[PDB]
DNA sequence: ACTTTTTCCGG
RNA sequence: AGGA
DNA sequence: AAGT
């Protein structure tokens, strides 16, 4: 249950994307973020002013967050972050920092080409952003020298000076993480054969990104406000809240701390080696080497399925699972937490025919009636009954299993010490059970068909199967054989009209699928209505008298 | 000063509401929140003007609540001060740190230090004043001070001001 | 229109944009043999003048973004002339409505 | 447009081979769609998936992560209009129920 | 919930400069001199000189007592008094700064009477001064045009001595002799 | 940008999606306590009493019809035509 | 139990916007967060108790709203922002169409 | 793939099926702007058929003693006879039922009469027929301007698109095309005064019937289309179980737009 | 040279 | 490891 | 089993 809260409500109209500025890390940042232990100030239970809790969230349940006064179930995280101690590539973006180092001069930062070619004023013209980098792209990543003087929008004889800077510009490749290059050189005008091969420095990329006019980067897919290429290397790294890497704290005194904690660890661990290293008597090579172990963690903990194979590994053999792996398709978060959803009030069993049963109607065993539950509001028409279900208790049919006050508060009917003596009042809401007639959305998995998913009155019926007419066995699909259904119940007033009014058995029969009726007589129905019919089939009095009677709406004649 | 400023509060009604007394409970729920009301951005909303014509607009339903949120587009007095701004008000409180003065609805403040060096602290009176060598300033004294400096404290504006330079003081 | 018969050379076809306001264009005698307009498959496209392509934008309230395209390439908008931003006004039978018609602008 | 006409044999003669029928409007639909981009648009991760919608509503499909990834390197705005975006914000889309807006009206309220 | 307004500035990510308020004539983004009404018209900025604004919340708190009892159907001493009175009446009571404004006004008023207020606006809205200027020259009594200059330093080289000299002559003669 | 009246172009009839959506929002109304326009000649089910309601065309409920360029066409669930 | 992509289908072939809402929402995950209206994120340290809003930062402690989105998508918005990644959500409209 | 493809398409208040762009997909839904459940298969009697027994069923030729209509079929038909003012209208409308034949002959090339269209009329006829226990012994109460104009002003009111622009009006008379060509067939005044046998009464209410039948025949904007077209032919996929490739793997083959196709071939 | 999907639901 |  |  969450709290009441003074500020407009809204909903969101557009989600505009971005890039974060080192800038506003350190700006939006609750902590910072030093030391890799978690918590246990000197093995002392509660946790260190280092990671999880300098001001983030909280962990403990009890005990609320020191920053947003809340707590738990009202406290989103609270982000914090780490100041790396060199920069480091995002992994997601190193193919986009590769190709925008072939679109620009690896010196002053200018396009490789401009308005002066006409191939190039041709690309620059393009409106899709994705489409104009494409083409900026295959045309700057041949130009392997930045241009001094062009010939003019006119004649070959007189040139204009475009732009300072002739250097050569590398051939880059790259080595799994690493951008190395190799520059065409001169010596004697030949010279490659055998050019000069180094690897670029993340520092000196950044520079060069920098250094990218607005007008520049803004050609290529860029945007000056939420995304400059320069923020595609990581100076400043995020710390997430325990929300995203919960402690899963089994028991009073053992941890249980989330992979993506003893991640940041690793990168914190890391950038600590790096940041002394380099502090300290410098042994260069040992720099190099830490810094690129840097690169590997803050890597493998955005994603660790990598095509340059170290897959980043707990010592269990068992790999670190990636912030990305986590997003990944089908049953993860966007697929399987937001597409698709586990609900509440939903319940399944095996299901069952039942020829007496009408179209609409679909058989709830008691049981089910029994938990599953309905929010009425107490209301002059209802109260009376309400009350008498109040009264009736969780335990015996039409009963009720919750009431909630104005105050928000729940009362348990089951434990209750005023269960018997409960004055309703307006506006109060009763969670009673399902009962008779009530619309429920009943569906049998897989659901290829809006006819897969309908919505049925409840016939509350003994025994533990949910008992349904024959004629709506083919639009579900489902045989008898073992076969079981979904029921999932509305809560509003309103849920239930969209239910009633639009997705009911009889509104589904004549299917837009194939113009026709989608359900018919089947089985035993079928096969009797022949025999019936035949020239040769006559009925006595007797017999034609209950198969009269039989039928609910007879004339009577 | 004083301004007649064009704004809009978006209120939401419950259900129980959705009777012929709905846009007269609406204006009343204006007032509300409204009059009497104080931001940084506006100042104090004072008094809601033009009761009669006040545009209640359509109120949408909202999703899965009963209730309607209608945009009230209204029109009322404000008071938002400056600093420069040179305020006529009544002296409030009086101590050795200096004295408070109620221009409307705002108190502001003048330091010992945005007075004159000549007027003293003279503890030994009912009630404390202030003595210049022509000058009384107490309680109930009418003043001119230059607001030097404003503070948005929640519910309020609470300002400091100055009766050190020329044309200004006790009037 | 100029009609080869096996090719244009590259050197040849560097001369085609440059008379403007004047257009041309390249077609190889050996497709049009046949009519590819006269097919069961092919309706009919007729080009929108700007006062015509102007008022389908005003009584659909569309952008141009939002209308189905044809290829400048299309063997149609060749056919046709069409230059980019053009529309055609595509007249197919239905075996639903009889008579349906479509849109496509020139891209 | 011969494409068009092609594609929809293509498509009907799968549908009626089974023996089954399906009504025109269905595969119209489908046709139409890989066709209205100027040639033919696939069915697939790189087909329809690397169109112009919202990055929130194509990242429900096949690249996901590497489709965020670029929303942000590039800036993308959600226009929010799309069904997925709305299941994601945990909003009502404007699909059937939601196409539309409800208000009360005090005039047409003091008349009843 | 708070108020918005006409002014519908889209601040994407820039956020800042607010930059500072004062005689400068340079007060806030909202209080500008080019405004939006409910119509969508530009109209000017509305200040007021108090009693200007003692008149126009008498008359809007008046007309109110009038729908107030319409639906329920089926001398400065003493002008406060009558003034605490209407408050009780039409305010939710709990405006405890209206009552001080209201007091404060009836008070420090210069004009008693709407004949008079409307000669004051009239004198004052000729200059052509910011609506900020007219309000200050009409709520703060000034003799030396130095004095005027002085206290509204946004006059400075708007408006001659002499000139400023003669509407403040005129503003003392408006002036009702409570 | 709203368009006025005279110059509406939508169904006269009322959508099976509108109606659905305002025996919803009305019977959710009426749930929450809300003045019911109409006898209620023994009703007790918000939604039996919000189609009661709407039988007599006497909700007080306008749908604005968005077209999909932002324009559109409010329209009164007294003027619509119930046919469906 | 599963209310899955398919369902979720189905449920949009109705027309049941609503009824798909409240799914995912009220019978699910929904959750409600404070965020900025300058840099739409989670950022707002709402102390909504002492009436206290705030978004250091952005130093805005009055542009701040209030939203119903389902827990997950807190998680999936804190995720992306935990590699880079900023989705901005915005109460308002600029782009028309 | 299907669902993920089509899900944001829809119908809007405009009877135009578009995309999360906004982009159009098509103009009118399914080309008609009608609700899939409200179709049936219906016959275009006008589409096959003897040139011959076309003329013996739709012709009325009042100029004539033996192609008039008897004053059997009608209290008109001894004042009927040589009527030249007529005679414009039962040539107008023949000349009509004749332009149908030839247009449907265009669409069905192979002369399919059984097509799927919006309000049965069989059943409206004979409905008529039981509601007003049709006397197939006595004369209609019928005037040759009561059938001929009837259908003229029921077609104006057989509304899918309302704007008031040409745009929009031609736009309007496209979908409605097909409709009115059976109508015209099945409600041609030999047709109505020798087979149905309907009088005034019975007319006008077929009349209004079919009027109001199509009206909630239209698609509901709102309409999810895009998912209903995928699922569609999603689930009919699933019970799959020259010789070119067929089923599931060609259907595999078309969504992928594959260009290396199993079975390719040419029908010259 | 190089990547990614594949119907729905007790331990 | 197993059901439809 | 396909396709950047
Ligand atoms: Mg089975
Ligand atoms: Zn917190
Ligand atoms: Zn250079
Ligand atoms: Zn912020």
Redesign the pocket.
């Known amino acids: 249950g969450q709290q009441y809260s003074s500020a407009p409500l809204r909903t969101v109209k557009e989600v505009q994307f971005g890039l974060f500025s080192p800038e506003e890390v350190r700006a939006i940042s609750v902590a910072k973020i030093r030391f890799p232990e978690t918590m246990d100030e000197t093995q002392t239970r509660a946790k260190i002013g280092g990671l999880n809790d300098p001001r983030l969230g909280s962990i403990d349940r009890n005990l609320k967050c020191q920053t947003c006064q809340e707590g738990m179930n009202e406290c989103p995280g609270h982000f914090g972050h780490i100041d790396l101690a060199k920069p480091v590539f995002h992994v997601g973006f190193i193919a986009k920092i590769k190709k925008v180092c072939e679109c620009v001069c690896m010196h002053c930062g200018k396009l490789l080409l401009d308005e002066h070619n006409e191939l190039m004023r041709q690309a620059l013209a393009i409106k899709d952003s994705k489409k104009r980098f494409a083409a900026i792209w295959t045309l700057c990543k041949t130009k392997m020298v930045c241009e001094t003087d062009v010939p003019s929008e006119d004649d070959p004889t007189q040139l204009v000076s475009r732009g300072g800077c002739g250097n050569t510009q590398p051939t880059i490749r790259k080595d799994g993480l690493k951008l190395v290059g190799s520059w065409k050189k001169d010596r004697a005008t030949g010279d490659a054969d055998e050019p000069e091969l180094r690897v670029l420095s993340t520092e000196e990329i950044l520079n060069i990104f920098k250094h990218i006019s607005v007008k520049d980067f803004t050609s290529l897919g860029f945007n000056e406000v939420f995304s400059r290429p320069e923020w595609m290397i990581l100076t400043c790294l995020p710390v997430p809240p325990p929300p995203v890497r919960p402690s899963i704290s089994f028991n009073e005194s053992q941890r249980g701390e989330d992979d993506l904690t003893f991640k940041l660890a690793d990168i914190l661990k890391a950038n600590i080696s790096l940041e002394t290293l380099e502090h300290n008597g410098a042994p260069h090579h040992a720099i190099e080497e830490a810094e690129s172990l840097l690169q590997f963690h803050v890597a493998t903990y955005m994603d660790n399925d990598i ?1 340059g194979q170290p897959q980043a590994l707990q010592k269990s053999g068992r790999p670190v699972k990636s912030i990305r792996a986590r997003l ?3 049953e993860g978060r966007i697929r399987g937490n937001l597409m ?1 959803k586990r609900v509440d009030f939903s319940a ?1 069993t095996v299901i069952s025919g039942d020829p007496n049963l009408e179209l609409d109607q679909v058989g709830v065993p008691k049981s089910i009636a029994k938990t599953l539950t309905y929010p009425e509001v107490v209301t002059p028409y209802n109260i009376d009954r309400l009350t008498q279900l109040v009264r009736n208790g969780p335990n015996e049919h039409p009963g009720a299993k919750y009431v909630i006050r104005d105050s928000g508060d729940r009362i348990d009917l089951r434990y209750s010490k005023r269960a018997g003596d409960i004055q309703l009042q307006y506006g109060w809401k009763v969670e009673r059970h399902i009962m008779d007639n009530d619309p429920v959305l009943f569906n049998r ?3 290829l068909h809006k006819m897969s998913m309908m919505a049925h009155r409840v016939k509350v019926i003994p025994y533990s199967t949910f008992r349904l007419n024959l004629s709506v066995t083919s639009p579900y699909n ?2 008898f ?4 259904m979904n029921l999932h119940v509305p809560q509003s007033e309103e849920t239930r009209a969209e239910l009633s009014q639009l997705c009911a058995v009889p509104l589904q029969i004549v299917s837009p699928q194939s113009n026709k009726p989608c359900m018919g007589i089947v089985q035993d129905t079928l096969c009797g209505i022949r025999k019936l019919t035949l020239r040769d089939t006559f009925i006595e009095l007797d017999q034609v008298l209950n198969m009269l009677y039989w039928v609910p709406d007879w004339d009577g004649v | 000063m004083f301004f007649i400023k064009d704004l809009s509060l978006n209120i939401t009604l419950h259900p129980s509401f959705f009777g012929p007394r709905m846009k007269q409970y609406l204006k009343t729920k204006l007032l509300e929140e409204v009059e009497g009301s104080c931001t940084g951005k506006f100042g104090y909303i004072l008094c809601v003007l033009d009761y009669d014509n006040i545009d209640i607009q359509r109120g949408r339903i909202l999703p899965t609540d009963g209730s309607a949120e209608f945009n009230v587009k209204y029109r009322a007095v404000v008071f938002k001060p400056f600093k420069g701004e040179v305020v006529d008000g009544t002296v409030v409180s009086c101590s050795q740190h200096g004295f408070e003065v109620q221009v409307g609805p705002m108190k502001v403040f003048v330091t010992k230090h945005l007075m004159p060096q000549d007027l003293t602290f003279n503890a030994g009176s009912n009630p404390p004043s202030y003595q210049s060598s022509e000058d009384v300033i107490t309680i109930k004294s009418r003043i001119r001070v230059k607001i030097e400096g404003c503070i948005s404290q929640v519910s309020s504006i609470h300002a400091i001001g100055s009766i050190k330079e020329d044309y200004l003081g006790a009037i | 229109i100029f009609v080869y018969q096996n090719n244009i050379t590259p050197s040849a076809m560097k001369l085609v944009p440059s008379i403007p306001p004047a257009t041309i264009e390249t077609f190889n005698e050996a497709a049009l043999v046949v009519n590819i307009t006269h097919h069961e498959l092919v309706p009919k496209h007729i080009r929108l003048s700007s006062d015509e392509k102007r008022e389908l934008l005003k009584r659909y309230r569309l952008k141009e973004s939002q209308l189905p395209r044809i290829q400048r390439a299309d063997p149609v908008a060749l056919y046709l002339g069409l230059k980019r931003g053009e529309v055609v006004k595509i007249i197919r039978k239905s075996e639903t409505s009889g008579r349906y018609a479509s849109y496509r602008i020139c891209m | 447009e011969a494409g068009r006409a092609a594609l929809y044999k293509e498509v009907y003669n799968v549908i009626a081979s089974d023996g089954s029928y399906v009504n025109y409007r269905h595969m119209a639909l489908l046709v139409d769609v890989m066709t209205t981009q100027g040639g033919l648009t ?1 069915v ?3 087909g329809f998936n690397r169109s112009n919608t919202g990055a929130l509503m194509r990242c429900s499909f ?3 992560v ?1 489709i965020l990834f670029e929303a942000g390197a590039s800036a993308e705005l959600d226009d929010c209009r799309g069904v997925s975006e709305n299941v994601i914000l945990g909003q009502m889309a404007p699909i059937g129920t939601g196409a539309f807006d409800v208000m009360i009206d005090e005039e047409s309220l003091v008349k009843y | 919930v708070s108020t918005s307004t006409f002014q519908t500035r889209r601040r994407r990510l820039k956020k800042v400069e607010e930059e500072e308020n004062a005689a400068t004539l340079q007060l806030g983004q909202e209080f500008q001199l080019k405004q939006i009404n409910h119509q969508g018209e530009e109209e000017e900025l509305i200040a007021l000189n108090l009693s200007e604004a003692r008149l126009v919340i008498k008359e809007a708190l008046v007309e109110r007592r009038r729908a107030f009892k319409r639906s329920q159907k089926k001398t400065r001493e003493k002008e406060l008094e009558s003034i605490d009175v209407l408050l009780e009446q039409t305010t939710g009571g709990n405006n405890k700064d209206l009552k001080n404004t209201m007091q404060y006004l009836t008070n420090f008023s210069r004009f008693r009477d709407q004949e008079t207020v409307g000669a004051v606006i009239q004198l004052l809205k000729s200059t052509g001064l910011h609506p900020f200027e007219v309000a200050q020259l009409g709520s703060l009594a000034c003799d030396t045009a130095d004095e005027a200059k002085t206290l509204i330093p946004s006059l400075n080289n708007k408006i001659s001595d002499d000139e400023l000299e003669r509407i403040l002559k005129e503003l003392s003669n408006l002036e009702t002799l409570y | 940008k709203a368009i006025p009246k005279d110059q509406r172009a939508t169904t006269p009839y009322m959508t099976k999606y509108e109606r659905a959506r305002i025996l919803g929002t009305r019977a959710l109304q009426i749930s929450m306590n809300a003045p019911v326009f109409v006898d209620l000649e023994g009703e007790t089910d918000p939604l039996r009493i919000a189609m009661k309601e709407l039988a007599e065309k006497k909700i007080p409920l306008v749908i604005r019809r968005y077209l999909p360029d932002g324009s559109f066409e409010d329209w009164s669930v007294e003027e619509l035509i119930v046919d469906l | ?2 209310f ?3 369902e979720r289908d189905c449920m949009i072939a109705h027309g049941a916007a609503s009824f798909l809402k409240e799914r995912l929402m009220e019978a699910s995950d929904a959750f409600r967060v404070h965020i900025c209206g300058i840099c739409g994120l989670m950022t707002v340290i709402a102390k909504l108790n002492h009436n206290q809003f705030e978004c250091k930062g952005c130093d805005n402690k009055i542009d701040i709203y209030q939203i119903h989105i389902p827990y997950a998508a807190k998680l999936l918005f804190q995720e992306l922002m935990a590699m880079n990644i900023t989705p901005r959500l915005y109460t308002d409209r600029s782009r028309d169409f | 793939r299907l669902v993920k493809a089509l899900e944001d398409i829809m119908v809007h208040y405009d009877n135009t099926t578009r995309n999360s762009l906004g982009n159009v997909i098509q103009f009118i839904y399914g080309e008609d702007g009608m609700d899939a459940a409200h179709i049936e298969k219906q016959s275009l009697d006008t589409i096959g058929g003897s040139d011959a027994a076309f003329e013996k069923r739709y012709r009325v030729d009042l100029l004539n003693t033996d192609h008039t209509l008897d004053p059997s079929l009608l209290e008109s038909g001894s004042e009927i006879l040589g009527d030249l003012k007529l005679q414009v209208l039962l040539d107008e409308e023949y000349k009509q039922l004749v332009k149908d034949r030839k247009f449907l002959r265009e669409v069905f090339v192979d002369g399919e009469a059984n097509w799927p269209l919006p309000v049965n009329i069989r059943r409206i006829i004979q409905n008529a027929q039981q509601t007003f226990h049709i006397d197939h012994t006595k004369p209609s109460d019928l005037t040759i301007k009561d059938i001929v104009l009837g259908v003229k002003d029921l077609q104006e009111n057989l509304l899918v698109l309302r704007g008031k622009n040409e745009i929009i009006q031609n736009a309007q008379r496209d979908a409605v095309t097909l409709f009115c060509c059976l109508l015209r067939s099945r409600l041609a005044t030999r047709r109505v005064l020798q087979e149905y046998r309907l009088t005034k009464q019975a007319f006008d209410w077929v009349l209004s019937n079919i009027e109001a039948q199509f009206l909630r025949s239209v698609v509901h904007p709102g309409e999810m289309v895009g998912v209903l077209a995928a699922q569609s032919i999603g689930e009919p996929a699933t019970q799959m179980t020259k010789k070119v490739t067929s089923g599931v ?1 060609r259907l ?1 083959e078309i969504l ?5 196709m199993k079975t390719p071939s040419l029908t010259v």
Do not use: F, I, W
């Open positions: 095509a990944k398709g089908k698709g399944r998995q897989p659901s489902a045989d054989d073992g076969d079981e | 696939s697939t991760r790189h096949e690249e996901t590497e | 139990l599963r899955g992509e398919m | 793997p595999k992928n737009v594959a260009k290396n």
